[PDB]
Amino acid sequence: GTILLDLAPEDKEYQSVEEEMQSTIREHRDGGNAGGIFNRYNVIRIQKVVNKKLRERFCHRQKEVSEENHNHHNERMLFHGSPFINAIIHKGFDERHAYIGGMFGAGIYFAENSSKSNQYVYGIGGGTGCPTHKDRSCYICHRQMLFCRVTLGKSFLQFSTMKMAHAPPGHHSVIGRPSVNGLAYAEYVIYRGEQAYPEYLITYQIMKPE
Ligand SMILES: O=C(c1cc(Cc2n[nH]c(=O)c3ccccc23)ccc1F)N1CCN(C(=O)C2CC2)CC1
Ligand SMILES: [Zn+2]
């Protein structure tokens, strides 16, 4: 059973989440087609996801990865956008639904830039936008994204497409780094659902630039 705990805006924990969300917005190559046009979000609320069973699976794997990486689990807080956010907060991430179409193959994808995750909230390339207005740039409808704890362990650096089914030998994750001819922004990939915990559930709106 998942329990959603509201965080007060005056709480330093709420402020840290909003600060990372706002500060990591960037301009995307698609000129805002997938996620919309905006320089800031309006944060509606931030809830902590509490689930004992999911936490135990996460901590158990974190100990295993720590033992395989000279006692460093290498956790990072990263964003994830998905139309299936309800299933994620109740059952956790699931590699059985890993992104077949991804540049690093069938893994679970995360971004260090909140605006890159916002491109996936309504589907691949923003699908057809919000259910109500069918607008990928809707300023009215409340969106939701996750800010997750992700166990990276020994991360495998890549610049180019390399379709994998699992992390490479001796590794626990794959990080696609930006390059002039390749990625504009980073992407973090894990191949096991228990290497991520959906810590924060952010409800927000993109704001129309003035
Ligand atoms: O990893 C994906 C996934 C990711 C993407 C890409 C993606 N999605 N979301 C992001 O924030 C992101 C950031 C950087 C680069 C790519 C992304 C597309 C379709 C997908 F199925 N999954 C889909 C949602 N997940 C689940 O376990 C759902 C509940 C069944 C986790 C696995
Ligand atoms: Zn809308």
Numbering used by the authors: 1105 to 1314
Article excerpt on this structure:
Poly(ADP-ribosyl) polymerases (PARPs) are a subgroup of four enzymes (PARP1, PARP2, PARP5a, and PARP5b; PARP5a and PARP5b are also known as tankyrase1 [TNKS1] and tankyrase2 [TNKS2], respectively) that continue the reaction (PARylation) to generate long chains of linear and branched poly-ADP-ribose (PAR) on target proteins. PARP1 is involved in repairing single-stranded DNA breaks making its inhibition an attractive strategy in oncology especially in those cancers that have defects in additional repair pathways. Thus, TNKS activity promotes Wnt/β-catenin pathway, and TNKSs are potential drug targets for the treatment of cancers driven by Wnt/β-catenin pathway, most notably colorectal cancers. We determined crystal structures of the catalytic domain of PARP1 and the ART domain of TNKS1 in the absence and the presence of the ligands.
It adopts different conformations for the recognition of PARP1 and TNKS1, despite making similar interactions with the two proteins. In all structures reported here, a structural water molecule is observed (except for the olaparib-bound structures, where it is displaced by the carbonyl oxygen of the ligand; see later). As a result, we postulate that the TNKS1-bound olaparib is a higher energy state than the PARP1-bound conformation, which compromises the binding affinity of olaparib for TNKS1. When the PARP1-complexed conformation of olaparib is modeled into TNKS1 structure, severe steric conflicts with the D-loop are observed. Thus, the changes required in the D-loop conformation may not be energetically favorable. Selectivity of olaparib for PARP1 over TNKS1 is largely because of conformational energetics of the ligand.
